Short mmCIF file of C-alpha atoms and ligand atoms in Angstrom, two decimals:
data_model
loop_
_atom_site.label_atom_id
_atom_site.label_comp_id
_atom_site.label_asym_id
_atom_site.label_seq_id
_atom_site.Cartn_x
_atom_site.Cartn_y
_atom_site.Cartn_z
CA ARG I 8 16.04 130.28 -67.85
CA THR I 9 16.32 133.84 -66.42
CA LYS I 10 14.81 134.49 -62.92
CA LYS I 11 12.41 137.14 -64.27
CA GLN I 12 11.30 134.74 -67.10
CA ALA I 13 10.66 131.82 -64.67
CA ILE I 14 8.42 134.19 -62.59
CA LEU I 15 6.52 135.51 -65.68
CA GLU I 16 6.00 131.94 -67.13
CA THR I 17 4.96 130.47 -63.72
CA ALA I 18 2.62 133.50 -63.05
CA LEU I 19 0.98 132.97 -66.50
CA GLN I 20 0.24 129.30 -65.66
CA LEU I 21 -1.11 130.08 -62.16
CA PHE I 22 -3.16 133.21 -63.08
CA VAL I 23 -4.96 131.01 -65.64
CA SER I 24 -5.48 127.81 -63.53
CA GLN I 25 -6.10 129.53 -60.13
CA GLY I 26 -6.91 133.18 -60.96
CA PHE I 27 -5.14 136.37 -59.86
CA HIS I 28 -6.55 136.63 -56.28
CA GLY I 29 -6.52 132.80 -55.97
CA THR I 30 -2.73 132.84 -56.51
CA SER I 31 -0.26 133.98 -53.85
CA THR I 32 3.21 135.50 -54.59
CA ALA I 33 4.67 132.66 -52.35
CA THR I 34 3.17 130.02 -54.70
CA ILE I 35 4.52 131.93 -57.78
CA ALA I 36 8.05 132.23 -56.26
CA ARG I 37 8.13 128.53 -55.18
CA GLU I 38 6.80 127.17 -58.50
CA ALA I 39 9.35 129.45 -60.34
CA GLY I 40 12.16 128.29 -58.03
CA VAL I 41 13.00 131.81 -56.71
CA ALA I 42 13.05 133.37 -53.21
CA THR I 43 10.04 135.65 -52.43
CA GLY I 44 12.59 138.51 -52.15
CA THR I 45 13.70 137.97 -55.80
CA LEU I 46 10.02 138.06 -56.95
CA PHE I 47 9.42 141.46 -55.27
CA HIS I 48 12.68 142.91 -56.69
CA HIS I 49 11.50 142.49 -60.33
CA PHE I 50 7.78 142.94 -59.44
CA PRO I 51 7.01 145.14 -56.35
CA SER I 52 3.38 143.93 -56.28
CA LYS I 53 1.29 141.04 -57.68
CA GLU I 54 -0.66 143.77 -59.59
CA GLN I 55 2.57 144.96 -61.37
CA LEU I 56 3.45 141.31 -62.24
CA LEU I 57 -0.05 140.85 -63.82
CA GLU I 58 0.30 144.19 -65.72
CA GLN I 59 3.80 143.32 -67.07
CA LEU I 60 2.60 139.82 -68.06
CA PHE I 61 -0.56 141.31 -69.71
CA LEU I 62 1.39 143.85 -71.84
CA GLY I 63 4.03 141.20 -72.66
CA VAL I 64 1.48 138.66 -74.02
CA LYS I 65 -0.39 141.50 -75.88
CA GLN I 66 2.97 142.51 -77.52
CA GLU I 67 3.64 138.85 -78.58
CA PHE I 68 0.12 138.61 -80.09
CA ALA I 69 0.50 141.97 -81.94
CA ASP I 70 3.98 140.96 -83.24
CA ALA I 71 2.76 137.50 -84.48
CA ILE I 72 -0.33 138.72 -86.35
CA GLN I 73 1.54 141.68 -87.99
CA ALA I 74 4.53 139.44 -89.01
CA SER I 75 1.99 137.06 -90.73
CA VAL I 76 0.75 139.84 -93.03
CA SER I 77 2.47 141.15 -96.14
CA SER I 78 0.04 143.73 -97.61
CA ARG I 79 -0.79 143.92 -101.31
CA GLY I 80 -2.80 147.12 -100.67
CA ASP I 81 -6.28 145.56 -100.31
CA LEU I 82 -7.71 146.35 -96.89
CA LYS I 83 -10.31 143.51 -96.82
CA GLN I 84 -7.59 141.00 -97.80
CA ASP I 85 -5.24 142.33 -95.06
CA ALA I 86 -8.13 142.32 -92.50
CA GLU I 87 -8.78 138.65 -93.51
CA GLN I 88 -5.05 137.70 -93.11
CA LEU I 89 -4.93 139.54 -89.72
CA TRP I 90 -8.15 137.84 -88.51
CA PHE I 91 -7.01 134.32 -89.47
CA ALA I 92 -3.45 135.01 -88.09
CA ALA I 93 -5.06 136.10 -84.76
CA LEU I 94 -7.27 132.95 -84.63
CA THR I 95 -4.27 130.74 -85.63
CA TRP I 96 -2.24 132.33 -82.79
CA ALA I 97 -5.15 131.61 -80.34
CA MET I 98 -5.21 127.87 -81.36
CA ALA I 99 -1.37 127.63 -81.30
CA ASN I 100 -1.00 129.23 -77.76
CA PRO I 101 -3.83 127.76 -75.59
CA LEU I 102 -2.43 129.03 -72.25
CA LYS I 103 -1.82 132.65 -73.43
CA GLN I 104 -5.22 132.59 -75.21
CA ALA I 105 -7.02 131.37 -72.00
CA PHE I 106 -5.18 134.33 -70.25
CA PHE I 107 -6.77 136.76 -72.82
CA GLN I 108 -10.20 135.19 -72.36
CA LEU I 109 -9.88 135.71 -68.61
CA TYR I 110 -8.18 139.16 -68.43
CA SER I 111 -8.35 141.12 -71.81
CA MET I 112 -11.78 142.70 -71.25
CA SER I 113 -12.25 142.04 -67.55
CA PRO I 114 -12.47 144.60 -64.69
CA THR I 115 -9.35 142.86 -63.16
CA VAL I 116 -6.71 144.76 -65.23
CA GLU I 117 -6.33 148.54 -64.60
CA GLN I 118 -8.17 150.58 -67.31
CA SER I 119 -4.93 152.55 -67.99
CA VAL I 120 -3.01 149.27 -68.73
CA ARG I 121 -5.90 147.99 -70.95
CA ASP I 122 -5.64 151.41 -72.77
CA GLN I 123 -1.85 150.97 -73.32
CA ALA I 124 -2.55 147.57 -74.94
CA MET I 125 -5.48 148.96 -77.04
CA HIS I 126 -4.03 152.28 -78.33
CA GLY I 127 -0.32 151.49 -77.94
CA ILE I 128 0.43 147.83 -78.67
CA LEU I 129 -2.65 147.38 -80.93
CA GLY I 130 -2.68 151.00 -82.22
CA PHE I 131 -2.36 149.70 -85.82
CA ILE I 132 -5.97 148.31 -85.57
CA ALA I 133 -7.51 151.81 -85.26
CA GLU I 134 -5.21 152.96 -88.14
CA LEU I 135 -6.58 150.18 -90.41
CA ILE I 136 -10.18 151.12 -89.43
CA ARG I 137 -9.38 154.84 -90.27
CA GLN I 138 -7.98 153.70 -93.67
CA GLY I 139 -11.11 151.59 -94.34
CA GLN I 140 -13.38 154.50 -93.43
CA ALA I 141 -11.43 156.88 -95.76
CA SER I 142 -11.68 154.36 -98.69
CA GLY I 143 -15.46 153.99 -98.17
CA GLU I 144 -15.24 150.28 -97.18
CA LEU I 145 -15.94 150.67 -93.41
CA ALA I 146 -18.84 152.37 -91.60
CA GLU I 147 -18.23 155.56 -89.63
CA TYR I 148 -18.95 154.57 -86.03
CA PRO I 149 -16.85 155.91 -83.04
CA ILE I 150 -13.34 154.39 -83.52
CA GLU I 151 -13.04 153.12 -79.89
CA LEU I 152 -16.41 151.29 -80.05
CA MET I 153 -15.28 149.67 -83.32
CA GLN I 154 -11.93 148.51 -81.74
CA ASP I 155 -13.79 147.10 -78.67
CA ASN I 156 -16.13 145.39 -81.11
CA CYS I 157 -13.15 143.79 -83.00
CA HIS I 158 -11.86 142.66 -79.59
CA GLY I 159 -15.27 141.21 -78.52
CA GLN I 160 -15.72 139.36 -81.83
CA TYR I 161 -12.17 137.94 -81.59
CA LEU I 162 -12.90 136.67 -78.05
CA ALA I 163 -16.25 135.20 -79.20
CA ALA I 164 -14.69 133.38 -82.22
CA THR I 165 -11.76 132.02 -80.16
CA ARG I 166 -14.19 130.88 -77.39
CA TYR I 167 -16.17 129.07 -80.14
CA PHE I 168 -13.13 127.41 -81.76
CA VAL I 169 -11.58 126.38 -78.41
CA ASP I 170 -14.99 124.85 -77.40
CA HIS I 171 -15.37 123.16 -80.84
CA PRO I 172 -11.76 122.49 -82.04
CA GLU I 173 -13.01 120.23 -84.89
CA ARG I 174 -14.86 123.27 -86.39
CA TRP I 175 -11.56 125.22 -86.70
CA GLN I 176 -10.59 122.54 -89.31
CA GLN I 177 -13.74 123.39 -91.35
CA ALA I 178 -13.27 126.20 -93.93
CA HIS I 179 -17.09 127.01 -93.87
CA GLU I 180 -16.82 127.72 -90.07
CA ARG I 181 -13.65 129.82 -90.54
CA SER I 182 -15.18 131.79 -93.45
CA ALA I 183 -18.36 132.44 -91.39
CA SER I 184 -16.23 133.81 -88.50
CA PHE I 185 -14.51 136.37 -90.80
CA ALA I 186 -17.92 137.28 -92.38
CA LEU I 187 -19.35 138.15 -88.89
CA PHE I 188 -16.19 140.21 -88.17
CA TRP I 189 -16.06 142.13 -91.52
CA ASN I 190 -19.86 142.65 -91.89
CA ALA I 191 -20.12 144.28 -88.44
CA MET I 192 -17.76 147.06 -89.72
CA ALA I 193 -18.48 147.24 -93.48
CA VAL I 194 -20.57 150.13 -94.96
CA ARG I 195 -24.24 149.35 -95.81
CA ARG E 9 -33.99 137.99 -47.16
CA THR E 10 -33.91 134.13 -47.32
CA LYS E 11 -30.71 132.35 -46.09
CA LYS E 12 -30.13 130.96 -49.61
CA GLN E 13 -30.48 134.45 -51.21
CA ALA E 14 -28.10 136.09 -48.63
CA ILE E 15 -25.49 133.44 -49.67
CA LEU E 16 -26.04 134.00 -53.42
CA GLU E 17 -25.84 137.82 -53.00
CA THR E 18 -22.70 137.55 -50.75
CA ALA E 19 -21.04 135.11 -53.23
CA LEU E 20 -21.84 137.47 -56.11
CA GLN E 21 -20.09 140.37 -54.26
CA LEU E 22 -17.04 138.26 -53.27
CA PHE E 23 -16.65 136.34 -56.59
CA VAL E 24 -16.48 139.76 -58.31
CA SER E 25 -14.15 141.60 -55.86
CA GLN E 26 -11.88 138.61 -54.88
CA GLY E 27 -12.49 135.96 -57.55
CA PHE E 28 -13.77 132.40 -57.23
CA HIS E 29 -10.50 130.74 -56.00
CA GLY E 30 -9.60 133.88 -54.00
CA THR E 31 -12.82 133.47 -51.95
CA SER E 32 -13.27 130.79 -49.26
CA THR E 33 -16.64 129.22 -48.28
CA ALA E 34 -15.95 130.36 -44.66
CA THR E 35 -15.70 134.03 -45.82
CA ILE E 36 -18.97 133.61 -47.87
CA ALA E 37 -20.89 132.08 -44.89
CA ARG E 38 -19.46 134.77 -42.51
CA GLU E 39 -20.33 137.73 -44.79
CA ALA E 40 -23.81 136.18 -45.59
CA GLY E 41 -24.47 135.89 -41.82
CA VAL E 42 -24.97 132.08 -41.94
CA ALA E 43 -23.22 129.09 -40.28
CA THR E 44 -20.84 127.14 -42.61
CA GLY E 45 -23.22 124.16 -42.15
CA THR E 46 -26.14 126.18 -43.64
CA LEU E 47 -23.96 127.16 -46.66
CA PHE E 48 -23.14 123.49 -47.48
CA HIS E 49 -26.82 122.42 -47.07
CA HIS E 50 -27.92 124.78 -49.88
CA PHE E 51 -24.64 124.39 -51.86
CA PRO E 52 -22.58 121.16 -51.34
CA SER E 53 -19.50 122.77 -52.99
CA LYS E 54 -18.20 126.27 -53.92
CA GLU E 55 -18.40 125.08 -57.58
CA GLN E 56 -22.19 124.36 -57.23
CA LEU E 57 -22.71 127.80 -55.59
CA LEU E 58 -20.93 129.50 -58.57
CA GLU E 59 -23.02 127.43 -61.06
CA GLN E 60 -26.34 128.25 -59.30
CA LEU E 61 -25.36 131.95 -59.07
CA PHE E 62 -24.30 131.96 -62.78
CA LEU E 63 -27.61 130.42 -64.00
CA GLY E 64 -29.56 132.66 -61.59
CA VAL E 65 -28.04 135.92 -62.92
CA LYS E 66 -28.40 134.63 -66.55
CA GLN E 67 -32.15 133.93 -65.82
CA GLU E 68 -32.61 137.48 -64.36
CA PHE E 69 -30.92 138.99 -67.47
CA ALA E 70 -33.05 136.85 -69.86
CA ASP E 71 -36.26 137.73 -67.92
CA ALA E 72 -35.48 141.53 -67.91
CA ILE E 73 -34.65 141.83 -71.62
CA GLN E 74 -37.66 139.70 -72.74
CA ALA E 75 -40.09 141.60 -70.41
CA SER E 76 -38.93 144.93 -71.98
CA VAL E 77 -39.90 143.89 -75.58
CA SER E 78 -43.17 145.21 -77.17
CA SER E 79 -43.01 143.13 -80.41
CA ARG E 80 -44.90 144.31 -83.54
CA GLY E 81 -43.61 141.42 -85.69
CA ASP E 82 -40.55 143.22 -87.12
CA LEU E 83 -37.43 141.20 -86.33
CA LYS E 84 -34.95 144.11 -86.67
CA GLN E 85 -37.14 146.28 -84.37
CA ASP E 86 -37.38 143.40 -81.80
CA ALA E 87 -33.59 142.81 -82.04
CA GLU E 88 -33.10 146.59 -81.41
CA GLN E 89 -35.40 146.56 -78.32
CA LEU E 90 -33.61 143.41 -76.99
CA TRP E 91 -30.15 144.92 -77.58
CA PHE E 92 -30.95 148.22 -75.82
CA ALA E 93 -32.77 146.36 -72.99
CA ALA E 94 -29.60 144.21 -72.51
CA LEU E 95 -27.32 147.30 -72.46
CA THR E 96 -29.79 149.13 -70.09
CA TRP E 97 -29.69 146.10 -67.77
CA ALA E 98 -25.82 146.15 -67.84
CA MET E 99 -25.78 149.87 -66.83
CA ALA E 100 -28.51 149.32 -64.15
CA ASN E 101 -26.79 146.24 -62.49
CA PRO E 102 -23.04 147.03 -62.29
CA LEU E 103 -22.19 144.10 -59.94
CA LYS E 104 -24.06 141.42 -61.97
CA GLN E 105 -22.64 142.93 -65.21
CA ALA E 106 -19.04 142.80 -63.80
CA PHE E 107 -19.85 139.09 -62.90
CA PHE E 108 -20.73 138.45 -66.62
CA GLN E 109 -17.50 140.24 -67.78
CA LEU E 110 -15.52 137.95 -65.47
CA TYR E 111 -17.35 134.58 -65.86
CA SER E 112 -19.74 134.49 -68.97
CA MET E 113 -17.11 133.46 -71.52
CA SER E 114 -14.31 132.34 -69.23
CA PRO E 115 -12.87 128.81 -68.77
CA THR E 116 -13.91 129.08 -65.02
CA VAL E 117 -17.56 127.98 -65.52
CA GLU E 118 -18.16 124.33 -66.61
CA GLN E 119 -18.90 124.13 -70.39
CA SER E 120 -22.12 122.14 -69.55
CA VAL E 121 -23.41 125.02 -67.35
CA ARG E 122 -22.42 127.65 -69.99
CA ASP E 123 -24.44 125.47 -72.50
CA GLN E 124 -27.52 125.44 -70.20
CA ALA E 125 -27.39 129.27 -70.09
CA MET E 126 -26.82 129.55 -73.89
CA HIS E 127 -29.35 127.00 -75.27
CA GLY E 128 -31.72 126.84 -72.27
CA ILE E 129 -32.04 130.24 -70.57
CA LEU E 130 -31.13 132.21 -73.72
CA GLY E 131 -32.62 129.64 -76.16
CA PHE E 132 -34.95 132.36 -77.56
CA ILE E 133 -31.84 134.04 -79.15
CA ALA E 134 -31.26 131.00 -81.43
CA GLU E 135 -35.02 130.99 -82.29
CA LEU E 136 -34.86 134.66 -83.36
CA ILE E 137 -31.74 133.96 -85.51
CA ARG E 138 -33.56 130.95 -87.17
CA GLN E 139 -36.60 133.22 -87.86
CA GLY E 140 -34.33 135.93 -89.36
CA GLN E 141 -32.59 133.38 -91.59
CA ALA E 142 -35.93 131.93 -92.80
CA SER E 143 -37.26 135.47 -93.61
CA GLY E 144 -34.12 136.32 -95.62
CA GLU E 145 -32.99 139.05 -93.16
CA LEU E 146 -30.04 137.24 -91.47
CA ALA E 147 -27.01 135.53 -93.05
CA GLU E 148 -26.76 131.73 -93.02
CA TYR E 149 -23.75 131.08 -90.76
CA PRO E 150 -23.73 128.29 -88.05
CA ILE E 151 -26.21 129.52 -85.33
CA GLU E 152 -23.91 128.63 -82.39
CA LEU E 153 -21.12 130.81 -83.89
CA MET E 154 -23.69 133.60 -84.37
CA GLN E 155 -24.94 133.25 -80.80
CA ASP E 156 -21.31 133.39 -79.42
CA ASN E 157 -20.82 136.43 -81.68
CA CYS E 158 -23.96 138.14 -80.15
CA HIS E 159 -22.45 137.37 -76.72
CA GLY E 160 -18.98 138.76 -77.64
CA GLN E 161 -20.50 141.96 -79.15
CA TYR E 162 -22.66 142.48 -76.05
CA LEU E 163 -19.57 142.14 -73.80
CA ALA E 164 -17.62 144.54 -76.06
CA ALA E 165 -20.42 147.22 -76.08
CA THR E 166 -20.99 146.94 -72.30
CA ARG E 167 -17.19 147.17 -71.69
CA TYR E 168 -17.25 150.36 -73.82
CA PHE E 169 -20.27 151.94 -72.08
CA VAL E 170 -19.05 151.01 -68.56
CA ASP E 171 -15.63 152.57 -69.44
CA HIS E 172 -17.33 155.66 -71.01
CA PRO E 173 -20.66 156.05 -69.09
CA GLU E 174 -21.21 159.57 -70.56
CA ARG E 175 -21.35 158.04 -74.10
CA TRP E 176 -24.30 155.81 -73.06
CA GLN E 177 -26.28 159.13 -72.80
CA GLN E 178 -25.47 159.91 -76.48
CA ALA E 179 -28.00 158.47 -79.01
CA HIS E 180 -25.43 158.35 -81.89
CA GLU E 181 -23.12 156.15 -79.68
CA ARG E 182 -26.09 153.89 -78.83
CA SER E 183 -27.24 153.69 -82.47
CA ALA E 184 -23.67 152.83 -83.62
CA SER E 185 -23.54 149.95 -81.07
CA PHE E 186 -26.75 148.39 -82.48
CA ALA E 187 -25.47 148.91 -86.09
CA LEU E 188 -22.29 146.86 -85.31
CA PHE E 189 -24.47 144.14 -83.68
CA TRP E 190 -27.12 143.93 -86.50
CA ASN E 191 -24.70 144.32 -89.47
CA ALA E 192 -22.56 141.39 -88.24
CA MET E 193 -25.66 139.12 -88.71
CA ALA E 194 -27.60 140.76 -91.58
CA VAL E 195 -27.59 139.28 -95.16
CA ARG E 196 -25.24 140.82 -97.75
CL1 CL T 9 0.40 129.20 -74.64
CL1 CL T 10 -25.98 144.55 -59.54
#
């Protein structure tokens, strides 16, 4: 409805179907129904538009998975709720999920912007790992390697369930996905 | 050296720096030093060139990691050698590794071609998982989910070590990366 929102929504569609460098600002503006001048006012470069979109979608994801969890104090239970809320979000938002698969861990997004998403927007993930390490449930590996690992396993499980959508309906497949996630981190 | 190889190497450079849809066949042919006619002889479409490049780099990766293994019959030891050979390859080939980060798990490559790389070129990975399950060393989850998980953990660890190249020189960082990889799969 808003000019800025039409640009962001149109950019999301095009960056997924045609890529970042495969998409021109003229195409974005036209498909959004705005003058090229209006696009550059809100976003001075195509790079800034991608960065704002990236952080925006990351914030939506973080907000959805945290709002789905009401803790009872058990870390493994909360980790399970967060994992299945993340995977549910991925199946419910196929365009935004395809955007993560393409840009979340790619050399395309500036490392500093990927850092803001990792330690800022998803800062609570490292806090849960720290709590699990302190309680003796999680192994003591470098925190940043463990968060990248959570991120890689999420992308692997969502690739799997998008490729085999019938398996997302099978509890044995879902349980196996959490087991791979938890057992990578758990103390041995 | 060969006309076909100059094209594949040029396409690799451009598909990484400018993307697939951001790169034209004219630019590829020009930068490879070949006539557009020669490009289409070897590769009838830009899609076929990406697919042949993709399978080619996957075959090089598979060949390098398998050639670096001195197996003694211990699965965990062989998995450790394969994991560190894969990460060594990623650090040694920054362009081809960036190509995997961008295309290996992305919706850009045809699912059929991603399947040929997964079950054909890297078919030995599934065989090692089956052997580990039969020996009581690896958990019994669906093998395709486990293989996607191996793939996601590799991309996460190589993202980490490319972002922090000084940590790749630290044995405790390296050991922690294998621990996350092995413990995801191992029986509990
Ligand atoms: Cl969506
Ligand atoms: Cl390279």
